[PDB]
């Protein structure tokens, strides 16, 4: 199996003005098999270069937000996974938010972590905020 583990590079992000369309992008590729995965640095996309059965996972560290914190893991712009937290307006929620799932992908398909449009702050520390995949094998 080929793998990729992408880590945030540190520094806090406010989702509204510190990102465009909510998409996380400045990922550090500490592990990436270049024959199976390609990273797109501005669009924040993790592209698969071959058909396969893929396990996909992510985790975003919510560090303070208004009331509703959430993101989607999208595949070709389509919601596949979601991780969501809540809090009462005036109070604080520091919270790692992990989700993961398995799906069949064809070559060139692109995966991305997209924050929902809200006032939400996230910490990009490498241990709390990450994004990865495992090609478990061929697709049927």
């Amino acid at each position: 199996p080929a793998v990729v583990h992408l880590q945030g590079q540190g520094s806090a992000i406010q989702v509204k003005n510190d990102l465009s369309g909510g998409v996380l992008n400045d990922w550090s590729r500490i592990t990436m098999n270049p024959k199976v995965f390609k990273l797109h640095p501005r669009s924040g996309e993790l592209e698969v270069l071959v058909d396969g059965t893929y396990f996909i996972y992510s985790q975003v560290y919510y560090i303070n937000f208004t009331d509703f914190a959430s993101y989607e893991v999208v595949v070709d712009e389509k919601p596949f996974l979601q991780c969501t937290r809540s809090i009462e307006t005036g109070k604080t929620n520091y919270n790692t938010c992990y989700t993961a799932g398995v799906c069949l992908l064809k070559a060139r398909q692109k995966i991305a972590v997209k924050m929902v449009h809200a006032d939400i702050s996230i910490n990009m520390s490498k241990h709390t905020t990450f994004f990865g995949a495992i090609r478990l094998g061929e697709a049927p």
Copy 2:
């Protein structure tokens, strides 16, 4: 590796009165290997057809509860995994609860996601509530 990723059928559920024994059901079967896995949609049970080493995972999107929200991933009615949340707010508790783990299984054993009996609502959207398994290989 044979995999299965069951997605909810796009509906908000009130656990107490909309499920039987808290068991999430009416799963949509997008990707399921028919030689390893068999689905029982109304029961909500996922049956393994062959012995093996299985990674099992699940997410439930909690959308309303005032006390506790908890579920168990059960194998023949025995708890294997458990995901739990207490309230994050006095208003509306939007919160996804993911859990996963590896276990050995025998043929004809059945897995289910079983809510604890309480005043809980859930969003059964395809990207928010899901239930899957990976046959990594044989069991030793």
Copy 3:
């Protein structure tokens, strides 16, 4: 693929004690490929016995906490993953805290679950608190 699923053996721990630097060691070794994995019962370290690509996961059940509840998954004492909850609610909080990720490892390296030192309680039940890994295959 070689797997390991370690489960807590029940009861609870008061994290304020800071025994063994917060490193959890209550692990029951239910499934463990002995050719790839070794558990040290006193230190709580999970040692890989061969080089390879490893998916590592953990869940800790925070049962009584008020401010920050956090833990790290460490590799040779170096943080790799982190799971964190500080939910300001006015009452005591109860959350399971799952995280996971993939990394390449050499033989003899040791993985542990290290609680950050806090006056919280964690429940060590076998269904709510666990620690595991999948050797996906050889590392490139």
